[PDB]
Write a protein that binds this ligand. Structure first.
Ligand SMILES: *[C@@H]1O[C@H](CO)[C@@H](O[C@@H]2O[C@H](CO)[C@@H](O[C@@H]3O[C@H](CO)[C@@H](O)[C@H](O)[C@@H]3O)[C@H](O)[C@H]2NC(C)=O)[C@H](O)[C@H]1NC(C)=O
Ligand SMILES: *[C@@H]1O[C@H](CO)[C@@H](O[C@@H]2O[C@H](CO)[C@@H](O)[C@H](O)[C@H]2NC(C)=O)[C@H](O)[C@H]1NC(C)=O
Ligand SMILES: *[C@@H]1O[C@H](CO)[C@@H](O[C@@H]2O[C@H](CO)[C@@H](O)[C@H](O)[C@H]2NC(C)=O)[C@H](O)[C@H]1NC(C)=O
Ligand SMILES: *[C@@H]1O[C@H](CO)[C@@H](O[C@@H]2O[C@H](CO)[C@@H](O)[C@H](O)[C@H]2NC(C)=O)[C@H](O)[C@H]1NC(C)=O
Ligand code: NAG
Ligand code: NAG
Ligand code: NAG
Lengths: 352, 375, 50
């Protein structure tokens, strides 16, 4: 197959760990195919800007797309991917309703969170959720709360102010036992941690849970002294042989030119996913060709790309032991058969 | 003076287009009129919405009436903000302050939370559909945290029609273990019917139970099933049938050729259609106000395409939006006033119960005053 | 009167069962005896679950 297999990319910031990891991982690509990054810097929230960029990449004839999406523009993107039969790789938050052309390289924590809450004798607790797509995980809880009969006092951070936190915590500490779940983004978690450090983070019967796939990245140093419990999840193991070699090589190369966030790790893994699919396609000798028509995305009717279906199957079929874990995909197009590491942080203790 | 207009209508919405046509004939005049270009599509397919919106934009439409769903809000609002093109909807109001979007549907959280307090509720279920967002769900949960309520929130929007019967019964079996005699059915007409037709089967429409139908159309459904069971049924209605304009509109509505105006013969009118009719009135009033004020609105040329780098909005759109927001008229729904953000204000939401004789109003609700009681 | 004998043919049994339901008299307290040689012939799916 041709080595000019142009691939797209939608990113919010030119300089960031995620972008740097995506740029680096391509260097390791020694496969006969040559994948082009073809990055476009686009604001995620604005759906119009994104539709412009996605149609531009359609004009270029891009075979596959990698990028991020937020709550506002998940639907829009998803819709275009199921209509033009064009695949879209992403490490962003996973969604319940989606096409088969959207490959989400982020296993869902909703199931595991339920198990962890179940194991501990949790009778009542407070839930803190970010509106940034966390709602899918809220319903699950509210649905399991009825089946299993615990009380959940949800509070939203997006529409909560300092006074809101003050009142919530004041009403919370009136209870003898204090249990809290904190679903948040990567950056919102740091600000909320700062908020709780100011007060109400004493550690007097306070038990926090952090529904973030990456718990080592977060700076919980302030929590190692106050004597408070916190439980979290990890998806990436740095000690294992493949992660150790990958981290050593990558950090040595970068220094010759810290620990990556889980988002950056998934970004790096996605390059491997796309490369594996295209390597297997070249090996399987499948006829892939891009017509120069480059029809406008807003073509009435928009004929699906004939080959784009098989690509999807190929991208779904790939399987390998990547950095984060073993990479696999369900029929719906979501990570399957993976492992998470439960991790409690004691005053001086990181216990798996 | 014809002014170009665009219209979007969800696949399978016949009454609303009929009310659109009726409003056209009613408010059309020799000196002013509207030229609507219509498109019918699946509003939950953002691709189709984008295609239709871009086609109409290319057709030089000054404003676009239409509907939207939870999977098409963001697309539409972003396009309107970027292109400074207005959008008039009876669909659910945005959870935000998005500009260039006029909303004909009043909010409901205030009336809902006042009513739940006129009855001194502490332990109630909340069945909700995964549509029109979860804004009211969040409001209810927050007020629960403040007031120490006990809310059992359950989703029913992801239920297969083929296997619908088994799930609902198990749902109510679960609720029974908690003695949940109180329920809020926050769903659209169709699912409210599909649920009321399964409360009856299991005999949960009796003296002990209370139901609150969190919808602006209370009569729209079929309440003749539960009038007589003995159970309370409360709800909200914006379209007051004891009004003058409403009665005249009904006179013109019942005497309508269903061969031409599907859904028109019946004496009932759904709130979506009522808001569509009022929307035609709104557009005419704003555009005629522009004509009287001599505001210059005209597309000298052609709007190339929706997708164009850079985006170059045409600067008369602000005038159109301000005119649309600066209109104060009476209509079927009641008094129509807007903010600088587009949300409606100074409106009255009539409250209703169900009695063996039939639905009867007991009070109303306005943002300024309170829940107000007459009967 | 929590107990009743519906000695009628299929059609009127249906027309009555469709008015016990409306008024919610198909509940735990009530008992009905359908004095007919055809029991299934009617529509009993309405009252199986009351
Ligand atoms: C990506 O999406 C949009 C546009 O690129 C950005 O959202 C927009 O953000 C601006 C600035 O925060 C908002 O303007 C301000 O809005 C507030 C209300 O939120 C208002 O009080 C201010 O007077 C001002 O008008 C704008 O409303 C908002 N638009 C929408 C549709 O949300 C978003 O910030 C962008 N993100 C990045 C990283 O560029
Ligand atoms: C689920 O993932 C595990 C990875 O832990 C898979 O186990 C590996 O499977 C491959 C393929 O058969 C073997 O070559 C490896 O030796 C297995 N390793 C371990 C540690 O089990 C497992 O096969 C996956 N399940 C499915 C259905 O694919
Ligand atoms: C069904 O409606 C009736 C009438 O509104 C309710 O009966 C009233 O409820 C109050 C509340 O304590 C009781 O004192 C009386 O039984 C009635 N009084 C008045 C003034 O109406 C009944 O409670 C409702 N059912 C439910 C489950 O709320
Ligand atoms: C409905 O059917 C049930 C089951 O046949 C009846 O419940 C029985 O009735 C006896 C009669 O005294 C009571 O001791 C118990 O409640 C049940 N016992 C047995 C052995 O079933 C119920 O009475 C019936 N309803 C009516 C109105 O007759
Ligand atoms: C907090 O951690 C301690 C161990 O340090 C253990 O008893 C339990 O996990 C938690 N106990 C609380 C929160 O009272
Ligand atoms: C990482 O893997 C090593 C062995 O490969 C194991 O000893 C260690 O416990 C793992 N770390 C976590 C956090 O699971
Ligand atoms: C606004 O509301 C009032 C009642 O509060 C009602 O007369 C009418 O709808 C409006 N009247 C105004 C704005 O004067």
């Amino acid at each position: 197959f041709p080595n000019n297999i142009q691939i797209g990319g939608l990113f919010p910031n030119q300089q960031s760990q995620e972008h740097a990891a995506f740029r680096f991982a391509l260097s390791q690509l020694t496969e006969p195919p040559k994948l082009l990054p073809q990055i476009d810097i686009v604001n995620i929230s604005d759906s119009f800007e994104m539709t412009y960029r996605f149609c531009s990449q359609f004009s270029k004839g891009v075979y596959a797309i990698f990028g991020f999406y937020e709550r506002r523009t998940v639907n829009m993107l998803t819709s275009f991917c199921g209509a033009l039969h064009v695949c879209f790789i992403t490490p962003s938050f996973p969604v319940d309703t989606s096409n088969q052309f959207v490959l989400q390289l982020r296993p869902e924590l909703q199931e595991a969170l339920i198990s962890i809450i179940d194991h501990y004798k949790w009778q009542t607790f407070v839930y803190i959720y970010d509106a940034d797509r966390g709602l899918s995980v809220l319903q699950r809880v509210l649905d399991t709360a009825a089946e299993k009969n615990w009380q959940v006092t949800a509070v939203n951070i997006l529409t909560t102010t300092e006074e809101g936190y003050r009142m919530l915590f004041q009403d919370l500490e009136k209870k003898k036992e204090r249990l809290v779940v904190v679903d948040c983004e990567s950056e919102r978690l740091n600000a909320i941690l700062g908020q709780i450090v100011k007060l109400e983070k004493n550690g007097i019967g306070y038990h926090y849970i952090l529904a973030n796939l990456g718990f080592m990245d977060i700076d919980l140093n302030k929590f190692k002294e106050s004597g408070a419990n916190v439980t979290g999840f990890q998806l990436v193991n740095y000690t294992d042989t493949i992660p150790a070699r990958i981290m050593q090589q990558w950090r040595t190369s970068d220094s010759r030119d810290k620990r990556p966030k889980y988002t950056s790790a998934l970004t790096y893994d996605g390059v491997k996913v796309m490369a594996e699919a295209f390597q297997s396609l070249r090996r399987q000798r499948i006829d892939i060709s891009r017509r120069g028509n480059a029809g406008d995305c807003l073509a009435n009717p928009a004929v699906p790309w004939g080959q784009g279906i098989d690509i999807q199957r190929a991208l779904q079929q790939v399987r390998f032991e990547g950095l984060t874990g073993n990479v696999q995909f369900n029929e719906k197009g979501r990570r399957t058969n993976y492992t998470l590491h439960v991790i409690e942080m004691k005053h001086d203790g990181i216990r798996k | 003076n014809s002014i170009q207009i665009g219209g979007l209508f969800p696949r399978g919405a016949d009454q609303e287009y009929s009310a659109f046509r009726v409003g056209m004939v009613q408010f059309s005049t020799s000196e002013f009129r509207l030229t609507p270009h219509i498109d019918n599509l699946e509003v939950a397919n953002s691709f189709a919405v984008t295609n239709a919106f871009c086609s109409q934009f290319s057709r030089g439409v000054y404003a676009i009436f239409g509907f939207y769903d939870k999977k098409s809000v963001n697309t539409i609002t972003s396009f309107c903000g970027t292109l400074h093109v207005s959008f008039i909807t009876p669909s659910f109001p945005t959870d935000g302050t998005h500009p260039f979007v006029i909303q004909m549907r009043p909010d409901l959280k205030g009336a809902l939370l006042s009513l739940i307090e006129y009855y001194q509720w502490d332990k109630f279920a909340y069945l909700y559909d995964s549509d029109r967002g979860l804004s009211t769900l969040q409001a209810v949960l927050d007020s629960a945290a403040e007031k120490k309520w006990q809310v059992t929130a359950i989703n029913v929007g992801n239920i297969n029609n083929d296997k619908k019967d088994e799930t609902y019964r198990s749902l109510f079996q679960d609720l029974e273990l908690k003695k949940e005699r109180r329920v809020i059915l926050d769903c659209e007409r169709d699912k409210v019917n599909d649920i009321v037709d399964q409360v009856i089967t299991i005999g949960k429409h009796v003296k002990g139970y209370h139901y609150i139908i969190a919808n602006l159309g209370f009569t729209d459904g079929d309440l003749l099933k539960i009038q007589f069971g003995g159970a309370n049924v409360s709800g909200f209605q914006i379209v007051d049938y004891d009004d003058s304009l409403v009665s005249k509109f009904i006179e013109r509505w019942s005497t309508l050729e269903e061969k031409e105006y599907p859904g028109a013969h019946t004496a009932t009118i759904k709130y979506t259609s009522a808001l569509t009719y009022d929307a035609v009135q709104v557009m005419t009033e704003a555009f005629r106000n522009l004509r009287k004020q001599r505001i210059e609105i005209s597309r000298r040329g052609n709007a190339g395409d929706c997708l164009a780098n850079p985006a170059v909005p045409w600067g008369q759109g602000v005038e159109i939006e301000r005119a649309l927001k600066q209109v104060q008229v009476e209509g079927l729904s009641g008094n129509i006033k807007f903010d600088q953000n587009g949300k409606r204000i100074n409106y009255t939401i009539n409250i209703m119960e169900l009695k063996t004789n039939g639905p009867r109003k007991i009070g109303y609700w306005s943002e300024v005053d309170k829940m107000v009681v007459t009967l």
